Amino acid sequence: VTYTLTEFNLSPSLNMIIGPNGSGKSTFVCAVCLGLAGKPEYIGRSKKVEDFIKNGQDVSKIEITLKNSPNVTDIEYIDARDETIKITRIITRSKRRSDYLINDYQVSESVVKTLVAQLNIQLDNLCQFLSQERVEEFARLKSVKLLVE
Amino acid sequence: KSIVITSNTVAKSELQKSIKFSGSIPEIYLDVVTKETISDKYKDWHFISKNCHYEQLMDLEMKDTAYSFLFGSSRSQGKVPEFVHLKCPSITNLLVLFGVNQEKCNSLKINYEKKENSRYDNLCTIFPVNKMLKFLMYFYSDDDNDDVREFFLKAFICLILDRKVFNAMESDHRLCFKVLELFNEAHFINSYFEIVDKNDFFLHYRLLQIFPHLQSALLRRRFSEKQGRTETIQQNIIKEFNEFFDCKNYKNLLYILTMYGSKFIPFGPKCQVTEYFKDCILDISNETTNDVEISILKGILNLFSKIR
Amino acid sequence: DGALINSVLYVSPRNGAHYFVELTEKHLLAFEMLNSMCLLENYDHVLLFLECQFGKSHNLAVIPFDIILVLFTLSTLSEYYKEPILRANDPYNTSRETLSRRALKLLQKYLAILKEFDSEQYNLYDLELLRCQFFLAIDTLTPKKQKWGKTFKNPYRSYISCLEQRNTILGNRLLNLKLNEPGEFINMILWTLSNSLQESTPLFLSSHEIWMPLLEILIDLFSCRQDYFIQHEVAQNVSKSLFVQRLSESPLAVFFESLNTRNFANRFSEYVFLNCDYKLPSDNYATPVHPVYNGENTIVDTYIPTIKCSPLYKSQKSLALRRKLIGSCFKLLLRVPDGHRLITPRIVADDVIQGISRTLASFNDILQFKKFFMTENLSQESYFIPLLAEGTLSEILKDTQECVVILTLVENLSDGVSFCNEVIGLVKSKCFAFTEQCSQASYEEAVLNIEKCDVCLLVLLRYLLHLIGTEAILDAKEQLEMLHAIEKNDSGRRQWAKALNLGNDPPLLYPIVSQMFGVHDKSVIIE
Amino acid sequence: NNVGSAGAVRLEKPKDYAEWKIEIMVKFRDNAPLKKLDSHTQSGGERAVSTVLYMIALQEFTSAPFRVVDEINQGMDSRNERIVHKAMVENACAENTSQY
Amino acid sequence: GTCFDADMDFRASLKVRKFSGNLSFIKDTKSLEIYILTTNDEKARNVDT
Amino acid sequence: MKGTLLQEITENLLYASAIHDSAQENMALHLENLKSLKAEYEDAKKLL
Amino acid sequence: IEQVDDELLSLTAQQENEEQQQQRKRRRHQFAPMT
């Protein structure tokens, strides 16, 4: 939406994005989240796949590159000594399936999901990812929930 | 041998039994209600003593909100008869729908012998006051005999004096002011004094809270010059103050709240009547073992003396 | 307009206030007495001082502005959750009424006194002083900058205010201080609008006992302040560009500045109609709402809720409050010069009209729709209600019929003949007529759209009667042909009434137009 | 410390093991007494800052490469938001930190 | 009542010197605080000041 | 407070309140002893 | 503690005497109208 060709650079220490809500910045962040084996209903928010897809364009594409270390298994085309993991998510209207890309190779969502699991990063858990519904849930937080976490 | 807890056990129990409410009713509410012994906050005149017929009243309400004319209801043309007579043909049926029982509808008076002016709240749900006043205005019918108008007036007076209606009453008494303007003010005061006792100054003060502009007129009905022989109204006020002071009816004496502000007993520092009242109040007041009404009178009289 | 806006005889304008009125000896003593009593937490005698001389005298006892703020805070101490505190403060309930209820009643009665200047009933100095006090309170209640989520200045030097040394009344923080926080004014508005239709007893009690009356009072006071600002604070003649800048500083501009959000149109449309029957479009994010004063959402054990309100009553009151909010918005907007647009609030009349029309045409319950469009006083709401009616009608015709016929009815309210001709054009186009493309299965939604269409046209027709009366309904053949075309659409709907898709009769507006200006079905039954 | 408040995440351990609970000490507001975190009693901005800092504390121990926070920099009173931005700056001063 | 009378009489007494003040009785501090505003300042300083 | 004769009132009130609290505690103790005597005398009535 | 009960009874008797003294007092002002 309003961004058909965009590139973003992210600081190694910490990142800041400035922009009004609804201008695509939240859309871009959600696209980045969905790229790494993410689904709209697994982030504690409403699912709108058509919002990501550009109105008129068939396919919307997000690419995310991460550092690679020899501590994660079930990878395609990428060696352990390699330092690059490229994960691509595409959303299209005609096709309804979970197909991701690892270094530009088509895979099921299971492979990317188990990779995300093996990177010690979690999407459903509220500690790693914080959303508006999750902010509200933390707002009224009981000691039992603290013990549980 | 020990079978009761002070006198609260019987009072709390028999308040709990006649409670007309389907809920929890925590024992803390019963304890705070039945252990007053100082003020009569929880004992008041309750015209509505049964749960309102919610379904039929809502039917009347959806009929009233949307209908053919969709215009202001005129005092004539029967006040949209076509559905109101199908639902509630008579004003007594409407009052039954409101929650008044048939026995009180037949005799629209406050029975002071049965202590109907001092009853615990029955915790009965009431229908909103404005819509009730609208349904009652639907039965005004100016063009009829005097008996029907008198019954309507007395029913309205009983309704507005109800504790629940007064508490759930709106800030602006638009419908109440309309009903009052339907009738003559002197006629209204005469009917009101037919309903309530003449020395029941608590309901006098409540009425003057509802309709302050009646104050002077009410006094002209309580201490009327012709009915007071050659004595003036101020002399009659002094005599009534004396009799309440000697009888030690300090609550009725306090509900002073009715007199002040009128032409006879005005606010101000230089009035003689207020000085005499305060002189007697400071006579009785001991501040160690007294009725609270004495201190309340002292404070109220001081405040009214300061008001210029 | 009235004297409330154009009575400046006794004013002594200052830098902070232009409505400022100096105190006289009697009013100075009254102010001192009220503040002294309020210092001792003797709120019962404050209310008794105000009530004992209300309506019993020609002269008026003016409430000081800080006492007005005290009463505003007292109105938030509802019995249903503050019964122990109120009983502790006043063990001998000599008035047989809660402090909250008495304070609220005094506020509403004095607002009624202020809204009309009876110079014969009350002398002009007291009325101007009361206006100054209310305006000072409102100016102290300026909203903070909107947040997604200076102490006290006394203009009078003749007395020490009670609010200088305190910020809470009975454990409740002062209303101005609570609302002079970044995200609390919008929070209060959303809270009352959401709980106005709640079936939960504590939330509905919070809306019905505390916040809807207070919001009514605040909106009325802000409207009066806006009128006074436009009358005096502006520089009369202006280059039409400095006037927009001054309007951006207007009390209503600051009022709605705490409601700007990101997109004023859609967010405002959702805000006003929060917790209504309409389906939420485009999965708008839910608006968090929290109680303003601690445990507003709880009912104390001692209090027993013994009042029941029918759904029609609650819906009517909520929709009336929503209309008041929208009317304040349009009152601010209509003063904006054509071409120019406001700087600080990014608000446009067309955007708000379209958003309200989108939310109204999406109502799936007709009761709330009618409650919004049924008003007891046509002249009061005459400046924005016809616009909303025509916009909702246009949108309904757009979604129901592929050919959107342009509606000029609002300016056609000037000439009844033009209005009737346009009605004939719409009905002959079959856009107002019941549409054949609608299927049997989806008959209910089509009925809903048609009955909303009829409501909008009925509103416009009532406004036409209000502006032209009943003079040439039959004298001009155009209005007669409009009535006969209404009968033609009656026959068109009756076609499917006889098609027997459902037993329920479709909405037919011939009897209603007959009752209003159809001369009781023309000559069907008259002759 | 940047807030100028003292607080610690204590694990109260009664005799029953399941009755062990978590206590958070609050000092950002002098009026607010030391109590468990809750939305209604405390202000929104201070509560948001406290929970954000609690999230930040449980980051170095976790092996997640980074943490994601949404609808956070939206203003909290322009003061609590300022101090939480200062805390974020201080955390970013340390190297090998998670990207937010 | 007593504190109200004392407060009002103190306010009326201070007008002789063209001042404006008030009494405040506090049970938390068990103290009586006098606040006086004279001609020069614009804030009611404590009477000890 | 002393000159306005409000200090003596508060002194008497607090003395009476302290007496009331102590008497209430002793009243609870008396209730316990009375129930104990009730049980003992009920045992005596069984012996009778 | 029997001394507490004795103090309670003494205070109650003092209150009884005080309320009797209050009950004994009458009105002393006659309200001469005069001027």
**Per-residue DSSP letters for C187-208?**
HHHHHHHHHTT--SHHHHHHII
Please judge whether B290 and G22 are an interchain contact, meaning their C-beta atoms are less than 8 angstroms apart: yes
Please judge whether B302 and E5 are an interchain contact, meaning their C-beta atoms are less than 8 angstroms apart: yes
Task: Return binding residues of A.
Answer: 19-26
Residues of G in contact with F16 (CB under 8 A): 11
How many Å apart are CA C468 and CA B238, to the nearest integer?
63
Resolution (A): 5.6
- CB within 8 A of C48, min separation 6: which ones? B300, B303, C95
Residues of B in contact with C54 (CB under 8 A): 212
Tokens (6 digits) for C197: 């239709």
Q: How many angstroms separate the CA of residue A94 from the nearest CA in chain D?
A: 31
DSSP state of D75: -
* Residue C350 near residue C277 (C-beta atoms within 8 A): no
Collapsed DSSP state (helix, strand, coil) of residue C219 = helix
The answer, for G5 touching chain F at a CB cutoff of 8 Å, is: yes
Q: How many angstroms separate the CA of residue A125 from the nearest CA in chain D?
A: 11
The answer, for F9 touching chain B at a CB cutoff of 8 Å, is: yes
* Residue C19 near residue C135 (C-beta atoms within 8 A): yes
Q: Do chains B and D touch (3 or more CB pairs under 8 A)?
A: no
* Residue C479 near residue C416 (C-beta atoms within 8 A): yes
Give the F-side interface with E, CB within 8 Å: 4, 6
Type and span of the H or E element at C455: helix C443-468
Please judge whether E6 and F6 are an interchain contact, meaning their C-beta atoms are less than 8 angstroms apart: no
Please judge whether E1 and B306 are an interchain contact, meaning their C-beta atoms are less than 8 angstroms apart: no
Using CB atoms and an 8 Å cut-off, which of residues 73-112 of chain B contact chain C?
none
Question: Can you point out the beta strands (E) in C91-136?
Answer: none
How many Å apart are CA C120 and CA C113, to the nearest integer?
13
What is the chain F residue with the closest CA to B287? F9
Bridge partners of residue B120, in order along the sequence? B43
From residue E16, alpha-carbon distances to C24, C161, E12, E38 in Å are: 17, 19, 8, 11
Please judge whether B289 and G22 are an interchain contact, meaning their C-beta atoms are less than 8 angstroms apart: yes
Please judge whether D100 and A11 are an interchain contact, meaning their C-beta atoms are less than 8 angstroms apart: no
What is the chain D residue with the closest CA to A116? D64
How many Å apart are CA G16 and CA C330, to the nearest integer?
71
Residues of A in contact with C283 (CB under 8 A): 46, 48
The answer, for A132 touching chain C at a CB cutoff of 8 Å, is: yes
Please judge whether B287 and F12 are an interchain contact, meaning their C-beta atoms are less than 8 angstroms apart: no
Amino acid B243 reads E
- CB within 8 A of C181, min separation 6: which ones? C144, D77
Please judge whether G1 and F26 are an interchain contact, meaning their C-beta atoms are less than 8 angstroms apart: yes
Technique used by the depositors: cryo-EM
- CB within 8 A of E38, min separation 6: which ones? E17, E18, E19
User: Computed over its alpha carbons, how large is the radius of gyration of chain C?
Assistant: 26
* DSSP secondary structure letters along chain B: ----STTHHHHHHHHHHS----S---HHHHHHHHT--S--TTEE--S--S---HHHHHHHHHHHHS-SS-SPPPSSTTSSHHHHHHH-SSHHHHHHHHT--HHHHHS-S--TTTTTTSEE-----B--HHHHHHHHHTT--SSS-HHHHHHHHHHHHHHHT-HHHHHT--SS-HHHHHHHHHS-HHHHHHHHHHHS-TT-HHHHHHHHHH-GGGHHHHHHHHS-TTTTTTS-HHHHHHHHHHHHHHHT-HHHHH--TTTTTSSSS--SSS-HHHHHHHHHHHHH--SSS--HHHHHHHHHHHHHHH--
Strands D9-12 and D21-24: antiparallel
- CB within 8 A of A68, min separation 6: which ones? A78, A80, A82, A83, A84, A85
The answer, for B267 touching chain C at a CB cutoff of 8 Å, is: yes
* Residue A70 near residue A81 (C-beta atoms within 8 A): yes
* Residue C273 near residue C359 (C-beta atoms within 8 A): yes
Type and span of the H or E element at C398: helix C385-400
Please judge whether G7 and F26 are an interchain contact, meaning their C-beta atoms are less than 8 angstroms apart: no
Q: Do chains G and E touch (3 or more CB pairs under 8 A)?
A: no
The answer, for A50 touching chain C at a CB cutoff of 8 Å, is: no
Taking the CB of residue C203, how many other CB atoms lie within 10 A of it?
20
Give Cα D59 distance to the centre of its chain.
12
Taking the CB of residue C27, how many other CB atoms lie within 10 A of it?
21
The answer, for B286 touching chain F at a CB cutoff of 8 Å, is: no
Please judge whether F12 and B288 are an interchain contact, meaning their C-beta atoms are less than 8 angstroms apart: yes
Please provide the size of chain C in residues: 527
- Subunits with 3+ Cβ pairs within 8 Å of C are A, B, D, E
Q: How many angstroms separate the CA of residue B214 from the nearest CA in chain G?
A: 28
How many Å apart are CA C200 and CA C184, to the nearest integer?
22
Instruction: Give me the torsion for CA of C63, C67, C70, C72, rounded to 10°.
Output: 30
